[PDB]
Amino acid sequence: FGWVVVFAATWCNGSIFGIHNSVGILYSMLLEEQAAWVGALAMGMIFFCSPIVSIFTDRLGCRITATAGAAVAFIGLHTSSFTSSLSLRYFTYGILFGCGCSFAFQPSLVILGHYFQRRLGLANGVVSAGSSIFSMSFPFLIRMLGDKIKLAQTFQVLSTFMFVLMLLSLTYRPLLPYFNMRVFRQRTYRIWAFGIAAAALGYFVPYVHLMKYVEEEFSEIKETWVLLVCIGATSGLGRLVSGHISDSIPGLKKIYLQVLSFLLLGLMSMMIPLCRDFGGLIVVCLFLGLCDGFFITIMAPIAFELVGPMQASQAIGYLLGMMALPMIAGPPIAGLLRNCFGDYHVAFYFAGVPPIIGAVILFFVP
Numbered sequence: 001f002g003w004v005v006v007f008a009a010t011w012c013n014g015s016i017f018g019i020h021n022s023v024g025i026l027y028s029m030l031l032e033e034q035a036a037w038v039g040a041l042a043m044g045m046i047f048f049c050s051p052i053v054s055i056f057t058d059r060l061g062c063r064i065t066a067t068a069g070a071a072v073a074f075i076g077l078h079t080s081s082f083t084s085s086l087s088l089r090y091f092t093y094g095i096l097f098g099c100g101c102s103f104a105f106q107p108s109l110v111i112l113g114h115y116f117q118r119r120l121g122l123a124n125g126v127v128s129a130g131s132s133i134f135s136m137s138f139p140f141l142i143r144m145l146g147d148k149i150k151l152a153q154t155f156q157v158l159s160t161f162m163f164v165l166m167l168l169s170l171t172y173r174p175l176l177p178y179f180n181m182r183v184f185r186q187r188t189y190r191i192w193a194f195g196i197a198a199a200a201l202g203y204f205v206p207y208v209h210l211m212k213y214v215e216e217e218f219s220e221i222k223e224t225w226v227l228l229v230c231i232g233a234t235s236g237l238g239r240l241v242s243g244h245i246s247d248s249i250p251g252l253k254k255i256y257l258q259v260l261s262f263l264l265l266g267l268m269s270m271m272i273p274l275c276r277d278f279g280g281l282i283v284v285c286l287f288l289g290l291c292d293g294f295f296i297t298i299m300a301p302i303a304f305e306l307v308g309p310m311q312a313s314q315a316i317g318y319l320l321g322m323m324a325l326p327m328i329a330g331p332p333i334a335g336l337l338r339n340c341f342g343d344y345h346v347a348f349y350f351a352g353v354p355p356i357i358g359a360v361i362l363f364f365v366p
């Protein structure tokens with residue numbers, strides 16, 4: 001019955017981050033029929049509310065919290081269709097759908113620890129790999145829909161994924177039996193969360209500015225899309241094996257194989273500006289995807305390893321809360337160096353440094 005929960009969490013993570021990762025198409029259509037920050041608000045509200053979501057999880061159960069969050073997300077994403085004013089779309093999709101996604105997603109991570117302890121890394125790896133499949137499908141589905149239906153009906157169609165998520169979150173049967181600062185009482189969690197938050201600043205910069213760099217520098221190449229394939233080809237792969245490998249390494253030594261990611265996640269991050277040809281860029285992006293998958297997958301299992309399963313909910317929620325600010329901050333800062341220095345090179349260097357600082361911080365946790 002654990003794989004039923006794995007399927008439910010896969011649907012959750014995939015739908016939430018496939019609707020968010022495809023936010024450009026719907027709003028491009030809306031312009032065709034200020035606008036930038038509502039998507040950032042929706043994406044960051046998943047992280048900001050996580051400390052709040054942890055308390056509701058601890059009190060009401062993962063099933064109840066996830067079901068309520070998915071219901072709120074469905075309500076927001078559905079009423080976003082009937083809204084004709086942009087101001088109402090800062091609420092219905094911005095804060096309402098955003099908070100719904102946070103309340104739906106934090107229990108999605110927490111529930112996997114109720115069932116798997118020995119193969120928890122494998123379960124999270126499968127969830128992340130399957131979720132990447134959803135994340136690389138929604139961009140297409142909306143572009144099929146737009147050619148036949150308007151944007152409002154597009155929100156209505158996207159709402160049934162939240163409806164199905166609300167139905168599926170009923171499977172979070174709890175086996176294991178309000179501002180608790182007791183999680184911060186552990187120094188290892190503090191240092192680990194600090195390092196993760198530091199790395200998150202430079203984490204999202206490549207997936208935002210890599211396309212712009214390629215279309216600006218490598219103008220002779222028209223088939224740039226293969227790069228997004230390469231990450232998609234490797235990241236999900238990196239999400240699978242790492243999870244399995246996450247089970248082979250016992251205890252806090254697991255953090256080392258996350259540190260190993262960060263350094264490479266940093267190093268390749270400074271290798272895009274150094275690539276004079278295209279094949280080198282593809283090779284670098286392969287390792288970038290692999291390190292992305294490693295960074296994504298190990299996050300939850302290490303929380304259970306450090307703080308246990310009675311406290312993993314608060315640890316995950318607070319970790320996402322601290323992660324919230326750097327993830328939003330990164331790409332805007334990279335755009336600032338882009339505008340100032342005249343190239344993305346300095347942007348990628350400042351994107352690659354924070355992963356290295358995070359690796360240095362995390363190296364001393366074990």
Ligand SMILES: N[C@@H](Cc1cc(I)c(Oc2ccc(O)c(I)c2)c(I)c1)C(=O)O
Pocket residue numbers: 017046109295296297298299300301303316319320
């Ligand atoms: N999912 C998108 C964006 C994204 C990336 C990361 I790192 C996120 O933080 C996580 C992820 C898994 C965990 O177990 C924990 I604890 C925290 C989140 I929330 C979203 C991507 O593929 O990059």
